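Retro notes, item 3 of 5
We never archived the inputs for the magnesium ion complex last cycle. Fixing that now. Sequence and ligand:
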Amino acid sequence: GNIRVYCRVRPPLLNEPQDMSHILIEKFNEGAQSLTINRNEILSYNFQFDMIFEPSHTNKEIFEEIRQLVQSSLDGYNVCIFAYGQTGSGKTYTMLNAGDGMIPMTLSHIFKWTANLKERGWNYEMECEYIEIYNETILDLLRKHDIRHDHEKQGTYITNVTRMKMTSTSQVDTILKKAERSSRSHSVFMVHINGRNLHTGETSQGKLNLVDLAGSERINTGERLRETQNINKSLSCLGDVIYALNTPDAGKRYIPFRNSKLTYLLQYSLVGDSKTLMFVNIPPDPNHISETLNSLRFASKVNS
Ligand SMILES: Nc1ncnc2c1ncn2[C@@H]1O[C@H](COP(=O)(O)OP(=O)(O)O)[C@@H](O)[C@H]1O
Ligand SMILES: [Mg+2]
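Structure as it came back at the time:
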């Protein structure tokens, strides 16, 4: 299916080092955008992405870049957007920032398009789930949960997880607001979209899966050592799955969906017609350069 990788370099916070000269972002070159990281010991690293957002690029500017993507979920597509990176790099800000976030923007633009489509005779019914995966166990944020797949109807649900009907842009916003560990867990906001055209009888089923990933950094008590092993293996698994789905021979490959809760849960949104987008968030601070490079490698591997 379709996979795209955007890199976002966030701007320095007030108390952080302010110098970005170690990061060089080329203008978009007609077919990838490149960035290079220089570390002075002088080592150069280069990476290619579908798009690179600079410290000056706003949430609203970025959403214009994913708008067609998330809109395609009313067109019968399953869509996954992931935000990946080191703790502090801007994952949650990108996805959740109030009124600005990919999640708030997508929800708004969804209701607008939905309302819009009544003119064509379309009636859409929407539900959301919001869950978090911590140590490969599932927590329902809208409150035992198991993942149940129907291979014939290509669909998925989690047992005993509240699924709330979505009414207004206002009403949806309250659910989010209402709902360190979070730095260590994956948070997954899902929007189930079913529609039918009153005049035509035409049916539409689509999905949005918006994911704020556990932080990717690698550690150096044993409850923490285990936790950090789950996280690292969960992230690797996600990377292996996306990479394998991208190969030209993918239909001939084993895809290890079953190796983590996130990939198992999302399997039918990762496959077939599905569209996937991954943000790599990176901090500007040269003090974090090695974690930054790990992040960049992870995402480029997936991209390739
Ligand atoms: N693009 C951005 N513009 C302004 N502030 C940002 C941006 N990205 C992150 N921040 C801020 O930097 C800090 C870390 O971001 P956060 O979203 O918590 O990181 P993560 O989710 O990757 O752990 C927060 O204080 C957040 O408000
Ligand atoms: Mg966070």
